[PDB]
Design a binder for this molecule. Structure first.
Ligand SMILES: *C(=O)N1C[C@H](NOS(=O)(=O)O)CC[C@H]1C(N)=O
Length: 259
């Protein structure tokens, strides 16, 4: 396709490795580029962890109100919300919102720990029929994004399908799905990534990620006014361990696949 040559060229010019999966719910069509290759999810794995907690809350009434202690020793590389609550408690709802909307790594660690650890988040993905997702480590090591390392990776195809199932499909109960959508729509970190490649007025819920090797990711549900939504995963990674992030590549991919 023309979109394929455009994604191929975007990738070639970038010098990196681009993974794209788009689902257009209007006709159930997909646009796939390296869609079965594994990419380090980085902070995009936060959606699966928050969704695991949402699922757990369907059978455990008042779960989101459960308090979690924040210690200074819990602080990692990035935790703008949790650092404000050192020696205080945050509810699982507050942790989910911090993880999803501010990409708070301590929040993600508390979500991971709540469900039983990285393997438990992976078990949750398996329960939804996602056989690709794997969460192996906690924050911050889950972001190393070493080329060829399968830890903490998924494929664009798998993540797009899962994200569709979570936000639009029946993977979660009605209220939990609406909650995840609300959390993602309220993301504050996504303006330079997928969103930057879309018409300014479109409603977007997304989760960005960054990591080693200039890994730059974004997973999104896009609701254009008067249209059916799109699910889009754009994963990008580079040859150099200390490569700077390339959110512009995700924005360019978003534009290519949405035009
Ligand atoms: C997630 O990938 N991380 C936590 C935080 N995310 O912010 S981002 O989604 O805007 O990139 C900072 C980067 C990253 C990490 N290495 O912890």
């Amino acid at each position: 396709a023309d979109v394929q040559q455009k994604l191929a060229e975007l990738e070639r010019q970038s010098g990196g490795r681009l993974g794209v999966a788009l689902i257009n719910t209007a006709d159930n069509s997909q646009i796939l580029y390296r869609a079965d290759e594994r990419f380090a999810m980085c902070s995009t794995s936060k959606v699966m962890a928050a969704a695991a907690v949402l699922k757990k809350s369907e059978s455990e009434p008042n779960l989101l109100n459960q308090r979690v202690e924040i210690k200074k020793s819990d602080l990692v590389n990035y935790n703008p919300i949790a650092e404000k609550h050192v020696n205080g408690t945050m509810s699982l709802a507050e942790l989910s919102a911090a993880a999803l909307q501010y990409s708070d790594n301590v929040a993600m660690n508390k979500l991971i720990a709540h469900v039983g650890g990285p393997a438990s988040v992976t078990a949750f993905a398996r329960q939804l029929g996602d056989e690709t997702f794997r969460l192996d480590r906690t924050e911050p090591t889950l972001n190393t994004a070493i080329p060829g390392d399968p830890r903490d990776t998924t494929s664009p195809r798998a993540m797009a399908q899962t994200l569709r199932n979570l936000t639009l499909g029946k993977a979660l109960g009605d209220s939990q799905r609406a909650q995840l959508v609300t959390w993602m729509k309220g993301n504050t970190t996504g303006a330079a990534s997928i969103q930057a490649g879309l018409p300014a007025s479109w409603v977007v819920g997304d989760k960005t990620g960054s990591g080693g090797y200039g890994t730059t990711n974004d997973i999104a549900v896009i609701w254009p006014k008067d249209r059916a939504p799109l699910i889009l995963v754009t994963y990008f990674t580079q040859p150099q361990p200390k490569a700077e992030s390339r959110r512009d590549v995700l924005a360019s991919a978003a534009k290519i696949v949405t035009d």
